[PDB]
């Protein structure tokens, strides 16, 4: 959660990185990762669903 609304020109992933929430799998994980990285921001706007 420390990465909320963060922005980057280069996101550096560490080999020690781990997941500590509900187990999840992303079909086409690479595509989502690549497009999010190319976007360069995690700027999240909440919407009134």
């Amino acid at each position: 959660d420390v990465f909320q609304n963060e922005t980057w020109d280069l996101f550096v992933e560490r080999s020690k990185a781990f997941s500590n929430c509900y187990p999840y799998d992303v079909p086409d994980y690479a595509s989502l990762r690549s497009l999010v990285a190319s976007s360069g921001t995690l700027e999240f706007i909440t919407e009134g669903f």
Binding site: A30, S31, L32, S34, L35
Partner: protein
């Protein structure tokens, strides 16, 4: 290109050399300018001009001929965001473009370098051939000119330019004027 408008070193009395080009000829790339008792004249060398032009046009034809023909190809512009496959296509096209740009740059640089080198080589070859025709009758000036120590009339100059020149029939007087 080495232009020579303002006589570049001397007055009209003594002019013409290899260190500087001539704008006063249009009939050939290479040529001669001569002064003698009969007056002054200029002419062009068709042999070296034709050889150089042939080489230049040949390399141009090599460069331009055999154009590649391509009909169906990957999509190179995308209106969507898709990720892995689209990024791969973009990377492939960018790699091809960069490699071909580098190839064009290197090819043009090499071709220009060798064009200049071969033209200078043709000029030096012509000068060397003229110098070896003037076996001993003449003496090299260092500015691209030969001083002929005899009465080398317009017929003499024509023989030198066209290759029928005979050194011996002037050798005695040329040497006598050189050393005495």
């Amino acid at each position: 290109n080495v232009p020579e408008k303002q006589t570049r070193g001397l007055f009209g009395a003594i002019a013409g050399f290899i260190e500087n080009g001539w704008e006063g000829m249009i009939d050939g790339w290479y040529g001669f300018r001569h002064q003698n008792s009969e007056g002054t004249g200029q002419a062009a060398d068709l042999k070296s001009t034709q050889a150089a032009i042939d080489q230049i046009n040949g390399k141009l034809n090599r460069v331009i001929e055999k154009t590649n023909e391509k009909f169906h190809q990957i999509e190179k512009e995308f209106s969507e965001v898709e990720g892995r496959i689209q990024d791969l296509e973009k990377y492939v096209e960018d790699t091809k473009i960069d490699l071909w740009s580098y190839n064009a740059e290197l090819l043009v640089a090499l071709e220009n370098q060798h064009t200049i080198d071969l033209t200078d080589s043709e000029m030096n070859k012509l000068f060397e051939k003229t110098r070896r025709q003037l076996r001993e009758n003449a003496e090299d000036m260092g500015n691209g000119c030969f001083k002929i120590y005899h009465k080398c009339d317009n017929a003499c100059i024509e023989s030198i330019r066209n290759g029928t020149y005979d050194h011996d029939v002037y050798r005695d007087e040329a040497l006598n004027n050189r050393f005495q």
